[PDB]
Amino acid sequence: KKNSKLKQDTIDRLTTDTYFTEKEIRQWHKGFLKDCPNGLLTEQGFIKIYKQFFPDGDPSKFASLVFRVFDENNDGAIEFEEFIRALSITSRGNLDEKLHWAFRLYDVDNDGYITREEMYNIVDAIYQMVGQQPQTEDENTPQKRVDKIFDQMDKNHDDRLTLEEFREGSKADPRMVQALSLG
């Protein structure tokens, strides 16, 4: 099939754009096909992998958010090239590259801004995956602590974060990106 074989044109673009050598890309493709013989990873297949790694909670909500960022062309599947591009940024990117990737995750509706509700949505997704925790203080909930972090980053108090607000906000308070292991 087209999707199953690794074409030289794909390798050329990947070595131009990513931190991986041709040798590493070919190695990763062998592994990609062992887990995904079709060369196309579906959303549910993506969720299944996240369940292999967090068997206690429910990673479905978080995995679906991450999937949308991986699937950069929005065709409903992660092809090998999209897999490598995301892995390059998240495992080998510099701080600015990782913070932009985090911004794309938090900006669920892709409108150029993070809202409070979008920030809640990611945070809730993480707790579902990792283990929800009870709060007996209505003034010390995740939603409220997130509000404080958000307010500190929202320099012009318009109730939304630009990429610049989020990136310079995260370099003084990296907690929203360390929650994704991208600090």
Ligand SMILES: O=C(CC(c1ccccc1)c1ccccc1)Nc1nc2ccccc2s1
């Ligand atoms: O989702 C994946 C990709 C995938 C993978 C498969 C094989 C080899 C390396 C990675 C995987 C990794 C860990 C658990 C489940 C799947 N990685 C990322 N996780 C996060 C989390 C937060 C923010 C950014 C990222 S990028």
Ligand SMILES: [Ca+2]
């Ligand atoms: Ca795709």
Ligand SMILES: [Ca+2]
């Ligand atoms: Ca948004």
Ligand SMILES: [Ca+2]
């Ligand atoms: Ca703002």
Ligand code: NA
């Ligand atoms: Na996408």
